[PDB]
Design brief:
- This is part of a larger assembly, with three copies of chain A (51 residues).
- By secondary structure, the first copy, chain A, is mostly loops.
- The first copy, chain A, has no helices and two strands.
- The two termini of chain A are 19 Å apart.
- It is classed as structural protein.
């Protein structure tokens, strides 16, 4: 699985398949979200700008 | 995120178990806990005479 | 915006957590809080004898 992002337009090819929509989260300084990287399990607690 | 706004004449102590590191901060700052950070909740005496 | 008009013979203290900066201003000025600024609300004794 991989995420494609940017101000652009997409057409899913026959091979690929849309899993999910992935709306971003707006964050300012001294605020963030706890992200667990399931590929490695590590939790990062990413704070600061939007993510 | 779990974040606490410390009062001006106050201090909060936290420990990051994932990093095995203690840190205590005094004054009026906004502390944000890392995913394995824990606060030092203090039980204190109060009441009319004392408790 | 949250803004307070300080009385002439008064003083208000605020802390910007996003900037990690304390500042207290006295006199009759119009203070405006930055998005992560917090006031020093003071609980004070009052009542007929005292409270």
């Amino acid at each position: 699985c991989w995420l494609i992002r940017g101000p652009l337009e997409y057409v899913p090819s026959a091979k690929v398949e849309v899993v999910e929509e992935r709306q971003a989260i707006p964050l300012d300084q001294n605020e963030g979200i706890y992200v667990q990287d399931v590929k490695t399990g590590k939790v990062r607690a990413v704070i600061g700008s939007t993510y | 995120v779990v974040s606490y706004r410390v009062p001006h004449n106050a201090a909060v102590q936290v420990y990051d178990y994932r990093a095995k590191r203690a840190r205590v901060v005094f004054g009026p700052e906004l502390v944000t806990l890392d995913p394995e950070e824990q606060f030092t909740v203090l039980s204190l005496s109060a009441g009319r005479p004392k408790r």
